[PDB]
Structure formats: structure tokens, C-alpha cells
Amino acid sequence: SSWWTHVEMGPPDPILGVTEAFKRDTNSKKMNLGVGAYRDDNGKPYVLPSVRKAEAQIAAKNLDKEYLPIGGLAEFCKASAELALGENNEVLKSGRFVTVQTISGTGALRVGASFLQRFFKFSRDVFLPKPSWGNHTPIFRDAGMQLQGYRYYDPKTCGFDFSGALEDISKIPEQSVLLLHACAHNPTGVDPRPEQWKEIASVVKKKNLFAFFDMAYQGFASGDGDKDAWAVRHFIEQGINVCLCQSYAKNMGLYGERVGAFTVVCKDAEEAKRVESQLKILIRPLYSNPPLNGARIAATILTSPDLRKQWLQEVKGMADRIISMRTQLVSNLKKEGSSHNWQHITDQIGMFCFTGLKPEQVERLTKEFSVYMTKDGRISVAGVTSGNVGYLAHAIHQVTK
Amino acid sequence: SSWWTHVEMGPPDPILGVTEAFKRDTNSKKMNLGVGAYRDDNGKPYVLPSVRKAEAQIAAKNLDKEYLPIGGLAEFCKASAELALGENNEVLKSGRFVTVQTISGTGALRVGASFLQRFFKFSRDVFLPKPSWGNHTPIFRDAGMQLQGYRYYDPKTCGFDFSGALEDISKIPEQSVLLLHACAHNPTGVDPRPEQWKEIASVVKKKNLFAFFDMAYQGFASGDGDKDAWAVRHFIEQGINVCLCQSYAKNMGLYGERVGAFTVVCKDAEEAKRVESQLKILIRPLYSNPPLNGARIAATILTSPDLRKQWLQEVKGMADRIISMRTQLVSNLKKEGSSHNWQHITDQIGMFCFTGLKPEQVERLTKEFSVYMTKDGRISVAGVTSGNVGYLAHAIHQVTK
Numbered sequence: 134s135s136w137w138t139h140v141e142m143g144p145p146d147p148i149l150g151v152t153e154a155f156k157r158d159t160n161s162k163k164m165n166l167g168v169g170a171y172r173d174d175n176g177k178p179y180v181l182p183s184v185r186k187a188e189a190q191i192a193a194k195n196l197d198k199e200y201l202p203i204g205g206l207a208e209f210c211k212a213s214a215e216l217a218l219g220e221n222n223e224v225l226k227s228g229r230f231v232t233v234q235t236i237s238g239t240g241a242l243r244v245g246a247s248f249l250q251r252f253f254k255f256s257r258d259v260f261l262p263k264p265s266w267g268n269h270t271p272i273f274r275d276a277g278m279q280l281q282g283y284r285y286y287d288p289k290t291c292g293f294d295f296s297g298a299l300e301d302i303s304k305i306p307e308q309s310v311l312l313l314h315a316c317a318h319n320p321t322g323v324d325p326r327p328e329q330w331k332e333i334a335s336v337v338k339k340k341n342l343f344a345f346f347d348m349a350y351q352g353f354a355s356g357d358g359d360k361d362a363w364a365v366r367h368f369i370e371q372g373i374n375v376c377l378c379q380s381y382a383k384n385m386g387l388y389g390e391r392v393g394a395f396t397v398v399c400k401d402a403e404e405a406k407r408v409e410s411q412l413k414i415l416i417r418p419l420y421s422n423p424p425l426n427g428a429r430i431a432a433t434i435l436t437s438p439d440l441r442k443q444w445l446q447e448v449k450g451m452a453d454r455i456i457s458m459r460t461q462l463v464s465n466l467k468k469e470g471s472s473h474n475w476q477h478i479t480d481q482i483g484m485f486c487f488t489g490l491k492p493e494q495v496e497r498l499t500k501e502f503s504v505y506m507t508k509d510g511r512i513s514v515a516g517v518t519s520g521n522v523g524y525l526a527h528a529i530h531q532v533t534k
Numbered sequence: 535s536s537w538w539t540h541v542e543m544g545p546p547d548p549i550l551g552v553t554e555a556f557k558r559d560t561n562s563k564k565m566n567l568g569v570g571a572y573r574d575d576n577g578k579p580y581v582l583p584s585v586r587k588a589e590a591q592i593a594a595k596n597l598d599k600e601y602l603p604i605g606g607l608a609e610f611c612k613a614s615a616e617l618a619l620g621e622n623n624e625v626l627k628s629g630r631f632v633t634v635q636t637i638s639g640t641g642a643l644r645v646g647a648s649f650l651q652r653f654f655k656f657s658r659d660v661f662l663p664k665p666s667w668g669n670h671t672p673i674f675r676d677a678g679m680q681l682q683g684y685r686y687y688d689p690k691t692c693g694f695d696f697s698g699a700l701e702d703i704s705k706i707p708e709q710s711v712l713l714l715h716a717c718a719h720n721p722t723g724v725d726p727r728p729e730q731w732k733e734i735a736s737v738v739k740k741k742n743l744f745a746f747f748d749m750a751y752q753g754f755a756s757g758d759g760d761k762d763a764w765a766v767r768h769f770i771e772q773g774i775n776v777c778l779c780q781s782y783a784k785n786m787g788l789y790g791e792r793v794g795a796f797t798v799v800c801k802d803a804e805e806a807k808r809v810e811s812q813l814k815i816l817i818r819p820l821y822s823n824p825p826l827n828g829a830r831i832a833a834t835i836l837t838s839p840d841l842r843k844q845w846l847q848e849v850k851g852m853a854d855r856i857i858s859m860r861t862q863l864v865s866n867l868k869k870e871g872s873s874h875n876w877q878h879i880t881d882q883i884g885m886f887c888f889t890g891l892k893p894e895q896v897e898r899l900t901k902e903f904s905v906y907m908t909k910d911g912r913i914s915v916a917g918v919t920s921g922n923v924g925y926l927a928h929a930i931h932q933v934t935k
């Protein structure tokens with residue numbers, strides 16, 4: 134026989150399928166609204182000029198390639214916590230926190246999930262919004278935790294079901310884990326507003342729930358990193374000792390460099406010391422130590438004041454392009470004579486948008502218009518450009534009118 | 535009152551607790567023989583010139599930083615199986631394998647572990663040699679396998695306990711997994727000879743054991759890649775469908791770039807496709823996709839005939855400097871007047887040496903002489919220079935006379 138005769142073929146990657154179907158289409162009008170990364174106004178990858186500058190200035194220094202500590206680059210870790218929390222947060226000043234470098238946002242989630250499995254004796258349940266990032270489920274599941282849900286997306290408004298979400302969260306059994314997207318919910322782009330978050334924080338604190346924030350889009354979501362991190366900060370100001378996942382894939386465009394971090398906010402520095410040793414003991418048999426290159430870039434940008442300013446402006450410019458496209462999409466839908474409400478499109482935030490389109494309409498969009506997207510109605514806004522937005526509005530109008 | 539009050543401080547690393555009494559040691563001829571990376575004759579980190587040239591050719595190409603496929607850089611994966619097996623290997627001509635890019639050797643070990651856990655229905659037992667790389671145990675425990683052991687190091691001879699190894703391997707329940715260091719065993723330096731391997735390969739095939747190679751040192755071990763890969767190639771040629779972990783940390787000096795690869799040899803190409811689908815399902819919730827920088831560098835070296843040829847001669851310089859410190863230590867111990875047989879310092883292969891020094895004597899070298907090594911009597915040969923080898927012979931002779 135063979136060792137692996139009984140190993141089945143896994144399911145096809147559905148996004149990969151869309152992107153590949155997109156590549157084969159010879160329609161000069163085609164659009165890839167399944168792309169999982171930022172694109173410029175001509176549909177190209179974008180390497181941030183501040184990143185190119187940072188890299189050049191690293192190359193000039195003739196650095197070694199030695200192993201990083203298990204927790205990664207110490208100055209990346211510190212700059213990264215400062216970015217998330219704000220430079221004068223009481224948490225930094227007291228040092229009641231540990232931040233370790235991870236293999237991007239996914240890496241941070243996987244290391245968090247392993248830490249919960251092993252140390253969060255209070256629960257095995259992690260509550261995910263409905264819906265959540267697809268990979269959140271297998272992450273927590275392979276880490277050895279259980280998944281639950283809470284109402285989030287409202288398919289009747291294509292907005293935030295605040296009343297269902299709040300009701301649900303108030304009946305989560307006490308001391309469960311509640312996963313929260315910091316901003317730019319994936320896949321819907323629907324976010325709670327600041328008053329909604331205050332209410333959610335107040336139930337969390339009341340019911341003694343543990344808040345696990347996923348933050349893949351600070352800055353990138355609105356152009357304002359302080360506004361994007363406001364919820365996380367606010368939960369911390371209210372007495373909630375969150376844990377936090379950060380990713381530099383979108384905000385710095387470091388996708389393939391794999392740069393992210395996991396932070397546990399603790400009672401005090403001594404507790405953070407013990408959490409850190411235990412994070413290290415878990416990190417080491419995953420991958421020993423994290424990659425160097427991307428972390429060098431991020432630290433150089435975050436700790437150099439000229440490079441940081443330049444970086445903040447470039448982030449603001451990506452965020453601005455996405456906001457532009459949503460607006461111009463809604464505008465064009467009106468010119469077309471659409472009579473549907475499309476404000477969810479300007480109401481949502483980040484590069485992912487739940488359109489409210491039905492699966493049959495999506496199929497018309499692929500077949501008749503060569504507009505490629507997933508069956509759940511999710512478009513990646515990064516595939517919209519000023520050149521093709523008029524066409525998108527037309528196509529969508531045709532399939533919905 | 536806190537989520538983490540019961541999280542205990544982990545034990546202090548030995549390899550980091552002594553490495554830091556070392557600076558405080560003020561004596562002028564002091565050596566750190568506990569470093570786990572190659573150092574040159576002046577004790578410095580060494581970036582290979584071919585790596586430097588590959589970096590510069592890459593810079594000029596102005597490449598993007600987009601995500602890799604879950605399995606990493608296709609061209610790195612293919613060049614890497616070719617490095618391991620020989621470009622005219624049977625296995626590669628027929629396509630009966632899958633190679634995925636991983637987070638160095640450690641990530642290949644964890645990915646493979648997690649594959650065994652989910653798909654190796656035959657058993658939960660993994661046989662490690664006594665002793666093995668420390669991280670092998672938590673890697674497999676955390677992944678959800680059970681650890682067993684087989685006799686390997688012969689403390690009487692500081693060499694290979696062939697008969698013991700073989701009796702142990704002969705009594706391994708059929709369809710258990712057997713882990714093997716491909717060459718340069720870590721931590722001891724003690725490898726089987728080609729005729730010894732032929733007999734391990736016989737037991738493995740007859741008793742239907744699964745063979746898991748860990749190959750961290752190809753070319754860096756002996757100076758000769760084909761010779762270092764020989765036992766892996768032999769097993770396959772013997773009808774053994776191995777899996778294989780590679781690392782470019784030491785041979786390319788790509789430590790902190792985290793470059794490695796995990797290979798499963800299968801009965802045919804359709805099995806490889808099934809297996810590959812399943813490695814992808816395991817990798818995605820670990821870290822989604824692998825780091826770009828290192829693999830780009832490795833791939834560039836391996837797919838350019840000129841560069842590849844240069845890199846192999848740099849690998850040979852490192853292997854050779856290590857062989858040279860090995861032979862110089864033995865002669866200098868003679869020169870000093872030692873009576874003991876020290877041919878083991880010289881039969882042993884790669885950057886790690888089990889010296890045979892008892893724990894008391896280890897203490898004496900640290901206090902009396904300022905020679906820092908771990909208590910098991912292991913030294914890093916990379917920390918021996920032509921500069922300090924004289925003094926080391928003197929110090930070792932004293933404590934052993």
C-alpha cells in the first residue's frame with residue numbers, strides 16, 4: 134500500500150478560484166474584486182515609498198542575519214505596542230504588558246489561541262462575530278479551542294446589528310473569550326460606532342468576559358490610526374485587560390514579509406514577565422524565532438520621525454483611495470437610476486465590502502460583466518479604480534434593477 | 535482579580551543564563567563555546583558573499599512584497615527538493631513528492647509533526663535518538679504526538695552505539711515513526727557511517743517504520759552536499775518513502791530570515807497532490823503563508839549555475855574551518871601532553887561536539903579557566919578560533935590529566 138492512501142484531497146480554495154478564473158478571462162473590461170491586498174489606481178501592487186527608503190537605509194548598514202530572540206526584535210515589539218496603545222498610555226508607562234513579534238496577524242492569532250488553550254482555564258469557548266474572517270475558525274480550532282458566535286452583521290441593512298450583538302454578548306456565559314475586530318471588519322466592512330463600543334465594553338466589563346482584539350488594519354481603515362485603535366484603547370481605559378493581534382501586511386504593505394505582534398495587557402509588570410516566559414515556551418516549538426527582515430523595516434519606520442511621518446501620509450493615501458471608491462460607487466449607482474439604498478457602501482470601512490448582492494446576481498456579474506467576487510457578495514474595494522468605477526456601477530445596477 | 539495569576543514563570547534557559555555570566559567574566563582569554571551559529575576565525579557573524587550578491591541582484595529587480603502561496607515560492611520549493619535529492623533523482627523525474635516552504639527547519643518540523651498527528655493513523659509514537667535536539671520534544675508533544683527514544687550516543691566511546699541503536703530500532707512497533715538526523719547529529723556530532731545506514735535502512739524497510747529525516751546541515755556538515763544528503767537518498771532508493779525537513783539557516787547563513795522546506799515523498803504524483811492539499815490546510819491556520827526575503831535569496835542562489843557554484847564553495851570553507859578547529863584541538867591536546875584518546879573530537883561531524891567532559895570538569899573550565907560550555911560537555915566548534923584553540927587545549931588538558 135502507501136502511508137497516505139487514505140489522505141483525501143482538500144476542498145478548492147474559493148478565493149484562489151475567483152482570482153484564477155479572473156486571470157483566464159480575456160474581457161478587456163474584467164475586474165478582480167476578490168483581490169486580498171491593496172492595489173493602486175492602476176490595479177498594481179504598491180510598495181510604500183517609506184518602506185523602500187527604510188530598506189535602502191537597512192542595506193547601507195551591512196547588518197548580520199543572526200537569529201532574533203524568541204520574542205523577536207525588541208525595538209519592533211516596543212514600537213509596535215506604542216503604535217497600538219499611544220505613546221503615553223498608562224499601560225506602557227507602568228510596563229504592564231508583553232508584546233512578542235509574530236508571523237504576521239495570523240501568527241499573532243495562532244500564538245494567542247495556543248496561549249488561551251494552555252492558560253485560559255476559565256473557558257474553551259471563543260466567541261466570533263457572525264460572520265468573521267474565515268481563518269479565525271481553523272486557527273482556534275487547531276489551537277484546541279471551541280468556536281461560538283454572536284450576531285454582528287444585519288443582512289437587512291447590510292449594517293451592524295447592534296441590538297442583536299449587544300443582547301448576545303450580554304448572555305455570553307461569564308469569563309468566556311470574546312473576539313472583537315478592532316476596525317475594518319472582514320469580510321463585511323461593518324463597524325460599531327464609538328457609542329456602540331462603549332456599550333459593548335460596559336457589558337464585557339459587567340459580565341467579566343475576556344476581550345481578544347484582532348487589529349489587522351490600524352491606520353489603513355480610516356487613514357487615522359488613533360481613531361482606528363480607539364476601541365482597543367477605550368476597553369483598556371475601562372479596566373479591560375485585552376490581548377491584541379497586530380499585522381503590518383496592509384498598513385505597511387509588508388504582506389509577504391510577515392510582520393505582526395501579539396500583546397497581552399496584564400495586571401502589572403511582574404505578571405507580564407510570567408506571561409512572556411510562557412509565550413516564549415509556546416513560540417519556540419512553533420517556529421523558534423521570527424523573521425528578521427520585515428521587523429527591521431517596521432522598526433526603522435516606527436522609530437524614525439521623518440520616516441514615520443512619511444508612512445502615516447502614505448497610509449492616509451491608501452485609506453483615502455478606498456473611501457473614494459466607495460463614495461464614487463454609490464454616486465455612480467444613483468446616476469445609473471438605481472433606486473436601492475446603497476449607503477451601506479459608504480457606511481462600511483476598510484477594503485472589504487458586503488454589497489448585499491445575492492449569489493445569482495454575483496453569478497450574473499461574473500458571467501455577463503466579468504466582475505469577479507465571492508458568492509457572499511463581498512467585494513474587495515481595492516479592485517475598484519476611477520477608470521473602472523463607472524463600469525462597476527453600471528454592471529451592479531443591471532443585475533439589481 | 536486577574537486572568538493570569540496562575541501563569542507560572544517558566545524555567546530559565548541554560549544557553550542564555552551562562553551566555554550572560556560570560557560578559558561579566560573579566561579574564562582576557564575567555565571563550566563562549568555555547569553559541570549556536572557559525573562564527574569566523576575572529577568570532578564574528580558571517581554573511582556569505584553569495585547571499586550578498588543574491589541580495590543585490592534581487593534589489594535591482596525591484597520586486598513587490600505580495601503574499602506567497604500557502605506553500606511558499608514555487609521556484610524555491612523545487613530548487614530545494616533538488617538540492618536534497620539530486621536533480622536527476624527518480625523522485626523528481628516522476629513528480630512523486632511535494633515540498634512546501636516552511637519557517638526554517640523548526641517550522642518544517644512542526645508542520646510535519648502536525649501532519650503526522652492528523653494523518654498518521656498507524657501510531658502516536660515518535661522515536662528520537664538519545665539524545666536529540668532539545669526542541670524536538672516540545673515540537674512533537676505540542677503537536678499532539680507521544681515521544682519515545684532509541685539508543686544513539688555511546689558515552690563510553692563518545693561515538694555511535696551502533697548495536698544499541700539497532701537493537702532498539704528492531705524492537706520498534708511496526709508502523710511507528712522514526713526520526714533521524716540526516717547528518718551532523720545535534721547536539722553530539724556523532725553520525726552513522728554509510729555501511730551503518732545501510733543496515734538502519736534494512737530494519738526500517740523490513741519492520742515497516744516511517745522515516746522522518748531532519749536535515750539541518752547539508753553541505754555545512756562535511757563540505758560536501760552529496761555526501762551529507764547520502765543517507766536520505768539511500769533510504770529512498772531502498773523503497774522508503776521518507777519525509778524530510780530542511781533548513782538553510784546554517785548552510786546559507788540565513789538564520790533569522792527563517793528559510794526552510796518540508797518534503798513528503800509519495801508513491802505517485804496524485805498522492806502528492808492530495809497530501810499537498812492537506813499540508814496547505816495545516817499551514818494556513820499556523821501563519822497563512824511564508825516569509826518572502828529568505829526564500830527569494832535561497833531560490834536565486836540555487837537557480838543560477840554561477841552563484842550556486844560559488845555558494846557551495848563558501849559552504850565548503852565553513853565546513854573546512856570547522857574540520858580544521860577539530861583537528862587542531864586534537865593535535866594541541868597531544869602537544870600539551872594528554873594521554874586520553876580524543877579521536878572523537880575528530881570522528882564527530884559538524885559544528886557540535888560532545889567532548890566527553892564530565893560536569894565537574896565543565897565547572898572547572900568555567901571558574902579556573904573561563905571556558906564557557908553547557909554542562910553536557912557539548913562545545914560549539916564554531917566558537918573555537920586559531921587564535922584561541924591553543925589555550926583551549928591547555929585548559930582541557932589540565933582538568934583531564
Ligand SMILES: Cc1ncc(COP(=O)(O)O)c(CN)c1O
Binds near residue numbers: 237
Ligand atoms: C481580521 C483579520 N485578521 C487577521 C488577518 C491576517 O493578516 P496577515 O497574516 O496577513 O497579517 C486578516 C487579513 N486576512 C484579517 O482581515
Ligand SMILES: Nc1ccccc1C(=O)C[C@@H](N)C(=O)O
Binds near residue numbers: 148169239319822823
Ligand atoms: N492570503 C492571505 C495571506 C495572509 C493573511 C491573510 C490572507 C487572506 O486570504 C485573508 C484575507 N485577505 C481574506 O479576505 O481573504
